[PDB]
Structures are given as structure tokens and as C-alpha cells.
Amino acid sequence: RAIGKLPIAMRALTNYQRLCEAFDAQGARAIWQALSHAFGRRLVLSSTFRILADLLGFAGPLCIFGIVDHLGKLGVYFVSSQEFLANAYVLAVLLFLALLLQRTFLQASYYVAIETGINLRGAIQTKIYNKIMHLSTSNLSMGEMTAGQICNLVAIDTNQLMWFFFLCPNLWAMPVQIIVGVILLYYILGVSALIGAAVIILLAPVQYFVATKLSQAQRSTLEYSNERLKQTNEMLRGIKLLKLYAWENIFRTRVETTRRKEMTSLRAFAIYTSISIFMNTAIPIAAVLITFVGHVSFFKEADFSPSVAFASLSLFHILVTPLFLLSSVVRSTVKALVSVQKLSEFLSSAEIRDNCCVQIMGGYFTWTPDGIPTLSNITIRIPRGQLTMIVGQVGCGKSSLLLAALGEMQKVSGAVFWSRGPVAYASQKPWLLNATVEENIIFESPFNKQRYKMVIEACSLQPDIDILPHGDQTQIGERGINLSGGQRQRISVARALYQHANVVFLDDPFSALDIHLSDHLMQAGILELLRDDKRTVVLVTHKLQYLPHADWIIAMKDGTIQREGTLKDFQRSECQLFEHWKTLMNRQDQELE
Amino acid sequence: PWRACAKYLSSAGILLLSLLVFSQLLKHMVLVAIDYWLAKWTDSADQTVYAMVFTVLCSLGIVLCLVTSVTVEWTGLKVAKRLHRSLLNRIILAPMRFFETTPLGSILNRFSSDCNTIDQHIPSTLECLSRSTLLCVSALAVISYVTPVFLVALLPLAIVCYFIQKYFRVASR
Amino acid sequence: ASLFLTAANRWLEVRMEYIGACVVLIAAVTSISNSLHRELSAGLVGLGLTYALMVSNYLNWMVRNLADMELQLGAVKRIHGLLKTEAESYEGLLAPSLIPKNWPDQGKIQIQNLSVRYDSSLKPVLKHVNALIAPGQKIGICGRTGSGKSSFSLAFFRMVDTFEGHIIIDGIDIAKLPLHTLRSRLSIILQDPVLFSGTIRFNLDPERKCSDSTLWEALEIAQLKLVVKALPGGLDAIITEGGENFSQGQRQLFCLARAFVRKTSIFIMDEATASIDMATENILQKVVMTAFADRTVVTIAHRVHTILSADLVIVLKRGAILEFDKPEKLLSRKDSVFASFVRADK
Ligand SMILES: Nc1ncnc2c1ncn2[C@@H]1O[C@H](COP(=O)(O)OP(=O)(O)OP(=O)(O)O)[C@@H](O)[C@H]1O
Ligand SMILES: Nc1ncnc2c1ncn2[C@@H]1O[C@H](COP(=O)(O)OP(=O)(O)O)[C@@H](O)[C@H]1O
Numbered sequence A: 001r002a003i004g005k006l007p008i009a010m011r012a013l014t015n016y017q018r019l020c021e022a023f024d025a026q027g028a029r030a031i032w033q034a035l036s037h038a039f040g041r042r043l044v045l046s047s048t049f050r051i052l053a054d055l056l057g058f059a060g061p062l063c064i065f066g067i068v069d070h071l072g073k074l075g076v077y078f079v080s081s082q083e084f085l086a087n088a089y090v091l092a093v094l095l096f097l098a099l100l101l102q103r104t105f106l107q108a109s110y111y112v113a114i115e116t117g118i119n120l121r122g123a124i125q126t127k128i129y130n131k132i133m134h135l136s137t138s139n140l141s142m143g144e145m146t147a148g149q150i151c152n153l154v155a156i157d158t159n160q161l162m163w164f165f166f167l168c169p170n171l172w173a174m175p176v177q178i179i180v181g182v183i184l185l186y187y188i189l190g191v192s193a194l195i196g197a198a199v200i201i202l203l204a205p206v207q208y209f210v211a212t213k214l215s216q217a218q219r220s221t222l223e224y225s226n227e228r229l230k231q232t233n234e235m236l237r238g239i240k241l242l243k244l245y246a247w248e249n250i251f252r253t254r255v256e257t258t259r260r261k262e263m264t265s266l267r268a269f270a271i272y273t274s275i276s277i278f279m280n281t282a283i284p285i286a287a288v289l290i291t292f293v294g295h296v297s298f299f300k301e302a303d304f305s306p307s308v309a310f311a312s313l314s315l316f317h318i319l320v321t322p323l324f325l326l327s328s329v330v331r332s333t334v335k336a337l338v339s340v341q342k343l344s345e346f347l348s349s350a351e352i353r354d355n356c357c358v359q360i361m362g363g364y365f366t367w368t369p370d371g372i373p374t375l376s377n378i379t380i381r382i383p384r385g386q387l388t389m390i391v392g393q394v395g396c397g398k399s400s401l402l403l404a405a406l407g408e409m410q411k412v413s414g415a416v417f418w419s420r421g422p423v424a425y426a427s428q429k430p431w432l433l434n435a436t437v438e439e440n441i442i443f444e445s446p447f448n449k450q451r452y453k454m455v456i457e458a459c460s461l462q463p464d465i466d467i468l469p470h471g472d473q474t475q476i477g478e479r480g481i482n483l484s485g486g487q488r489q490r491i492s493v494a495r496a497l498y499q500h501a502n503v504v505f506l507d508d509p510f511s512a513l514d515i516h517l518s519d520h521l522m523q524a525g526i527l528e529l530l531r532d533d534k535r536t537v538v539l540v541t542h543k544l545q546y547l548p549h550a551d552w553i554i555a556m557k558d559g560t561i562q563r564e565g566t567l568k569d570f571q572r573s574e575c576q577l578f579e580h581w582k583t584l585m586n587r588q589d590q591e592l593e
Numbered sequence B: 001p002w003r004a005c006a007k008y009l010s011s012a013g014i015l016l017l018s019l020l021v022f023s024q025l026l027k028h029m030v031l032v033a034i035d036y037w038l039a040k041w042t043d044s045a046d047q048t049v050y051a052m053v054f055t056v057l058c059s060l061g062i063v064l065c066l067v068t069s070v071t072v073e074w075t076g077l078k079v080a081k082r083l084h085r086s087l088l089n090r091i092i093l094a095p096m097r098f099f100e101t102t103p104l105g106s107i108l109n110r111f112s113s114d115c116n117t118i119d120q121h122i123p124s125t126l127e128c129l130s131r132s133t134l135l136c137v138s139a140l141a142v143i144s145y146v147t148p149v150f151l152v153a154l155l156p157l158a159i160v161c162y163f164i165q166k167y168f169r170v171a172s173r
Numbered sequence C: 001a002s003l004f005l006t007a008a009n010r011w012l013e014v015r016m017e018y019i020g021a022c023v024v025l026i027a028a029v030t031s032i033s034n035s036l037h038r039e040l041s042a043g044l045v046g047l048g049l050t051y052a053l054m055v056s057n058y059l060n061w062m063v064r065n066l067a068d069m070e071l072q073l074g075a076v077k078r079i080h081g082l083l084k085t086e087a088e089s090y091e092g093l094l095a096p097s098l099i100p101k102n103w104p105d106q107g108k109i110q111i112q113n114l115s116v117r118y119d120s121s122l123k124p125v126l127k128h129v130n131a132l133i134a135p136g137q138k139i140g141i142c143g144r145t146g147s148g149k150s151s152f153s154l155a156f157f158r159m160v161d162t163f164e165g166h167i168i169i170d171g172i173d174i175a176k177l178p179l180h181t182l183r184s185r186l187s188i189i190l191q192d193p194v195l196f197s198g199t200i201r202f203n204l205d206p207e208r209k210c211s212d213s214t215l216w217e218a219l220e221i222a223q224l225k226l227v228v229k230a231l232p233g234g235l236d237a238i239i240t241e242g243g244e245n246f247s248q249g250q251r252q253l254f255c256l257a258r259a260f261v262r263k264t265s266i267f268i269m270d271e272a273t274a275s276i277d278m279a280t281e282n283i284l285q286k287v288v289m290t291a292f293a294d295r296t297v298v299t300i301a302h303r304v305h306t307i308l309s310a311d312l313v314i315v316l317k318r319g320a321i322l323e324f325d326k327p328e329k330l331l332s333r334k335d336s337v338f339a340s341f342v343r344a345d346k
């Protein structure tokens, strides 16, 4: 607070609107043409300040050539220009007025480049959020990328593209610095100046050679560090099971072979950057060697003065001083090229295309773009406002039927007729927003205090909220305190008993809960707050004793459904699975009514 | 000076830490000596004795640039090889109460960003820092020898430089 | 905040470059006034001009690289802060020659006066408990949530703060043991399923030290053999990150198949049957009680009809043994906590 908000020209959704407006100007070349169409107007402004700087930094060598050649050496009033520009005090105060303007224009040209890098960071973070809100879950689950790679992309590759845009107008000054320094060297020494030719051709073949060898270091370096961060993430997530099985030496030697395999590419990278900075800082001292022995040998002596010697020494130093940054420039642009190729690989990924609520009717749902359909030919007549149980064995479709009605799956055939609306859904693995416990339960609803005190008392969060050091205000989740899992499943299903959304997709709440707390879920909350108002609750569980409390039972086996209907309908038609449920519950004497 | 640069100098070792300082200050003082030899060679009015030792004194500056460059890459690569391979074997032998009370994103944060910073982002900043401040202090060693009038002006500018450094440094931190 | 850090850093390098231009003015004026009305022969004056321009070029890089060296040495301060942490003190007081080569031969798990915590400051979550376990005694443990059930399975591996006690298996003290020898040969299976990305052969056996017949018979006694053989890999196929290629019951079933490759004597379980259905759950209890006759199998109960056919049943309410008796004896007493737990189920 009191730094205040940023203005309107640097907002996200002012830029990113310019970035999607550059997208409809019709790979990675579309992203580069969109960035050169979007942010190039201020990039040429920072290059305009960059080229208006360091031609005013070329008053150093002309000033030294002025005053050392001075210091070795209407008609009574006025002073001509050759008498004006050959005196040391007036040229030294012109040297003071040159360095203030070039060293203000350098710090303006840094600021416009860093400000457009910050607006690039805001626009590409909003475009990465608009990609991740339309991403299918088969990108994360079946194969291709990880969650750590997606949050590693914004943490690294966005900052690598931003740090390339911090040094973007320095690459466009690297023509105009060397060319005007060569013509200002040609003014001073003439034809003896061009046999300081280690600079003036650069051997830019060998600079492009060490640039492509830094590419051969850099792509294997980013691939091995993504593999090592993936292995370290699964090791530190599973360190409880790895310490209990004593497999920490085996997984540590896997991470250590990944670290040594990365480290050999780091050996190649540090040796190639070392010979780049050796070539970079040993070319201009060799250039003053071959121009200063080559002035007094091989060429007949045209006025080897201290003025032209210190002018050529300061001119090679001002010629060499932006050239010192070039190894960091070429590693930043190869990190940009690997960054924008991993960015263009991400945004072109797979995406999302009368008594009843959902009418899945003949729908083939598939987890895979190329595989066989996991969910088979199914026909579902889930009713309004009633408790409905999906039951079955392991791997029959009991979570995929819930994810099919959200539209997460790949719908091959059939049609789903909703009412899509809001839907209360607590998943199989639970989910914790990293905030206070009340803010995980509220989940951006209005704060209903009596309903919030009701759903704590519906599913017994009061003795496990009394044990917390701040109660409602405890920071649970990844950042902050660790819960048990029995409180995590209960804290995930307590937010899907709250959010007014009238279709409740309760996946399995009775893994981590016991018999008494599962019945306290089953008496109050379920059957007393979800059937209080007319809210459709679709409660898939393996706890088969609650199938008495069931207005609709869907049976699941091997990707297809057997039958839908009530429990007297399952008594009438099927009877084999009814006798199987009579044997599994050990209720042979009484009846499932 | 914090404790982290002390842990950086102990993890690099004294056998490369002695080669770090005693290549670079010798290279910058022979850069001062070849520019002083360029000053004294222009004071001509002895033939080629201010050319031949200028040639061998430039080629020793070239190979001193080479040993400074291989020393700075071998210190950065050795501290990449040694710091990780110690944090991993020290953090895998933790108790389970240490994993229970910490955020997991902190332990993944110190294996990703700080191991990214220690490997490749530190030694370019170290070679630019050592080259830039050693070029600056050898340039201030050049202008004391030419002019002794500069030393009565040097102290108020260094005083307002240190005052603007402290007065910036609290706000920047 | 990054634009404010930017504009503050450009403010610092503006004033430092202006001080360096004042150095160029003062050194230029004193080098021409030190050589006009004196004799300094102009090569030293051009030397002072070139190195004054070197001051103006390389002062801002010095303060920028010093502030960047402070900000990048904060990462070394964070890793040095993590690096002096607590170790678990892995080596025990016993010599490793005095433990047998076949250490888990038969399970005489003696418990006397155990009470655990998790650290020094907390409350004891286990009260003073004692039991004597035979090697053919396939016990089970019931209770409420938070009553010490998973902490009782974690106390066999010294994972919790067992600050006292007589937890001795086979006449050899478990506190006087090397921890790799302890947590190698005994195998727990947790409630929350943790799988690792890669292949199925690695995710059961990371050493690749057991045979493919042992992995296929461990998938036989889990009942996941017809699931994995109908997969297009067959074996050596991809499990992704978190085990999210498969179901949660398949993730618990791969935890069972990882538990069954290392042979045992002291199979201890948590409530591994949480996400599994009752049909394949009552299939899998009928296999591994019969496939493992001699091995002592301890299991925390989630369904008490699974636990009902054990040898003895421990009941843990609020960290103490309330009951340690026959299941038909605790059923026929008809007021017991085991009888009310099986009454509230079915
Ligand atoms: N995220 C996924 N990506 C690809 N395939 C999946 C995924 N989840 C499940 N499958 C496949 O779909 C089948 C059905 O699994 P589903 O998602 O319905 O879990 P489930 O059967 O409800 O789990 P449980 O029975 O333990 O509650 C499984 O056999 C599995 O092979
Ligand atoms: N990391 C921990 N630190 C302190 N106490 C814990 C920790 N984990 C679990 N406990 C305590 O152990 C008790 C028993 O929990 P547990 O054995 O996991 O399940 P159950 O409640 O089914 O017995 C809980 O009441 C809890 O307070």
C-alpha cells in the first residue's frame, strides 16, 4: 500500500489486448511477428535513445585528439572555429556536456527496454492464463507435460524472454557502434587503421560458431534441468514413502546421475563461454598491437602523435566496452529461442471443445486422442433434486462419468443435455486453496454466517477446528501448515455442501473418514442439508451400506453401465448384482429397501 | 560481507581462490603498465625497445586474460559441482518432522531458482564485478600518479558516493 | 513493485553516472591546468583522460554488479540456511554383525509400556500400551479417526517420537538398530497413495533386483494382472506424474503391488482399503491371508467386516488399548467398542 496502482498504459488487459490484437494480423514465427507488431514501437524508441547515445559517447576520442594536439603546440575581437576547437578548457567543458547527455540517454534506453519487458511479462502471463483455463486435463494426465513444467514455464521461460527484452536494443546498436568507430578510426590513422583488422571483421564466423555451440550446450542443459526438477519434485513429494521403504539412496543416485549428466553440459557451456570471453577480451588488445606496431612498421610514418595514439586507445576502448556484454547477449538470445519454442509448444496443445438435469444419451467418452473409448455406450437419466449413487469396482468409470458431464472428456459420439451451469464438485484427490480455512470453505461466495456455522456442524469440523492454532485463520495447504488427509477430504467436501450451485457432484468422501464420521456426513449434511432444499447430489461411493438411502442407483462395470434406476428396479430386473450386494454387505436376512 | 560469500569462498577452495585474485590484479596492473608504456613510447622527442617489450607485454596480457577466464569458469563450475551434491545428501537425511513443518515449495524453490542462480547467473556477475571494479580501482591508480591534485577532490566525491549508496541501499533492500 | 525497483535502480545509476561525469570534468580540468603552467609532457595527460573515461564507463557497472552480487548471494544464504539442518541420526548403537543375516525370521513383536509423541513439545497421542504378538498372529487394529491408528503403524519404524518403551522384535532392540536395516526388511503401506513417474518395473522395483515372475505373481496376488496385461504396454509401460494415468483405486493397488514384491515377515498395513470397493477388497483379503500364512500381517481396519476374521483384534480408542481379545469374545460381550463399531457398520 501507498506505492499505488500502475497507470492505464501498463495494465494487463490493456496489453494482452494488444497481444491478441497482434494475433489476428493474418508456430514461433507468429509469436515473433506478434511481438514485433506489438512492442516494436517502443523498442525502436529505446533503440532511438540507444543510437542517440554512444555517438555522443564518441566525443571522448575526438576530445583527446583535440586537446593533446592542442597541448603539444573585427580582427581583434572575434574567434574563428579552428581557434575555438583547439583549446583545452572549452573542449573539456564540451566533454562534460557530452557525457551528461549520453549517460542520460543510456539510462533512458535502459528504462524503456525494461518497461517493455515488464509489459511483455504481464501480457504473456495473461495469455498463459487464458491458455491454462482452456487446457484439457489429458495434457496433464496422459503423458505430455507436467504441472511442474507449466508452473516452471512462468517462473523461468517468461523471465528468460523478459531478460532477453532487457537487452534487446543493445543488439541493434552492435551494427552502429562498430561502423562509426571504424570510420572514426579511419579519420584518425587512415590506411594504417584498417590493419587493426581483428575487430573490423571480428571473426564473426567464430562468434557465430561459439553461439551455435552455446545452443548445443543450452538445449541439452534446459532438457536436463527440466528432467532433474521433475525427479526432485517427485522425490520430495514422496519422501515419506521413500524413507519408509529406504529407497532414498536409489532415488538419490537417479537424481545424481541426472545432475552429473546436466553437469557435463555445464562443463561444455562454461568452457565455451570461457573461450568466448577470452576471444572477446583478447581481440581488442591484439587490435591495438597490430595497429600500433603496424603504424611504425610496414607503413611510413605519418604523424605518430600522443593525440592520435591516445585517441586510438580510447577509441578502441569505447569500441570494446559494449563488446564485453556479448557473451551474456548470445546466451540470453539462445535462452529466448528455447523459451519461445517451449512457449509455442504450450499454446498449441489440446483443449476443450421434466424430472431431469443431465441427459447423457449414447455418449462415447474417451481419455485419449488415439485410443479406444474408456467410457462405452451409456445412457443416463439422473433425476432432479434426489440422491443418486454410482457404484462399481475399481476402474469401471466412476470418476469418468462425473468428468464426462463436466465436458472434460473427449466426446466421440452421443449428446449431453444439461439443465452448462455451476456444479458443486469435490474430487477424488482433494484440493486445498492455500489460504485461511474459512476462505477455503467460502470459495468466493457471499459469507453466509448461519450456513457457514451449519456446514461446520453438518460434517463435524468443530473438534478439528478447535485443535488449530488460529482456527479459521490457519494457513493450510502447500504453503503453511500440513493437515492429516481426513481433514483434507472433509474440508474439500465441506465446500461442495455450501456453494449454492444446485448440482452436487460428490466424488468419494469416505476414503479417509471412519464409520462414525461417515455416518455423521450421511445423517446431517447429506440427507439433511442437500435434500433440505431440492439439490441434486450425485454421490459415488464404495460404501455400499448407504444404498438404502438412494433414489437412483447406477451400476458400473468395465466402462459401460449395467442399468440405471432405483433399488426396487434393481430388485426386479437384475437380481444377480442384488444378490451380490446382499452377500457383500452381509445383510442376508433383512432386505435392501 | 555476509556468511554466504564466506561459504562461497570455502566451497570454492583456497587453491582456486588464490588463482582468482593473483591472475586478475596482475592482469589489470600490466594493463596499467602497457598504457604507461604507450605513454612513454609517444614521448620520443631507444628505437624499438618501446616496441618489442610492448609486444611481449601484450601477449602476456592475452594469456593472463585466458587464465583469468579459465579460473572464473572453473570456480563457478566447481561451486556448481560441490554445493549441489551436498544439499541433496544433507536434505534427504532429514527427519519427517522437518518435512512436516516446512512448505514443500520452499524446498523445491531452493532446488530450482537458487540452484539456477548459483550455477550460471552468479559467475557472469562475478567476472563482470571483478573486471569492472578492478578496472575502476586501477583507473584510480592511474589518476593519482599523473596528478596529485586529484586526491583532495577524491574524498568528498567518495563521501557523497557512500552517502548516496547508503541512502539508496535502505530503500533498495 | 518491479517497475518501482526498476525506476529506483535507474535513479541510482543516473546519480552515479553524473558523479562519474563530474570526475571526468575535475580530472580533465586538473590535467590541463597541471600541464599548462608546469611540464607534464601530455602522454600522462592523455593517460589520465583515457582512464578518467574508464572511470565514467565502469563505475555504474561496479555498483550494479555489486548490488546484483548481493541479490545473487542471497541464494547462497538461503542454501546455507537450509544446509545446517537436523539429521535423523541414521546409525544405531548396535553393531551390524550382531543382527542376523536372516533377521526377520519369525515375528515375536513385544510391546511394553509404549507412549509416543511427534516432537518434544506436543501431547502424547499414545497412552501406555502393551501387547505380545506371536509369529502366526495376524492381528488388526480398529478405532476412531485421530485415535493413534496410523501413528501405531508409524511407531514401528521410529518415525514418530518414541521417547520410551520396549518395542523389541525377536529379542533385538529396535532403537539399537541401523535404520536402513530396519526400514529395508519391514514394509508399511500408507493410506495416501504415492506413485512415481516412469515405468511399472521401476515403480515396483527401483533396483531391478527381483524377477519378472515375482512381479507378475505380485500382480496376480493383488488382482491387477488382467488390468496391466490388457494395457498396450503389457509391462514396462508409462505411469505418469502422481499416478494420474490410472485410477485412485489402481494407485492404491500399485501401492499393494509395491508392498508385495519385498517378501516380508512383518507386513504392516495402514487402511489401504479406503478407495477400493468391497468386492475386490474382499477378494484381496481372501488371497493375501492365504498366500501369506507364515508372515505376520498387521492391518489398520477401515471396514470392520474385513477385520472380523483376524486372530486377535486390538481396539485403539484415544491412544490406549481398550480391548485386546478374540473377535467372537468382543462380539459376544455386546457392549464393547468393537461390537458397537461392527453394529454401526452393519
Ligand atoms: N486421468 C486419466 N487419464 C487417462 N486415463 C484415465 C484417467 N483416469 C482414469 N483413467 C482410466 O479410466 C478408467 C476409469 O477410471 P476413473 O477415472 O473412473 O476412476 P475410478 O474408476 O472412479 O476410480 P475408483 O474406482 O478408485 O473410484 C481407469 O481404468 C483408468 O485406466
Ligand atoms: N505431523 C504430526 N504432528 C503432530 N501430531 C500428529 C501429526 N500427524 C498426526 N498427528 C496426531 O496423531 C493422531 C493420530 O492420527 P493417525 O494415527 O494418523 O490417525 P487416527 O486419528 O485414525 O488414529 C492425530 O490425532 C494427530 O493429532
Ligand SMILES: [Mg+2]
Residues within 6 Å of the ligand: A398, A399, A428, C247, C248, C249
Ligand atoms: Mg475414482
Ligand SMILES: [Mg+2]
Residues within 6 Å of the ligand: C146, C148, C149, C150, C151
Ligand atoms: Mg491414521
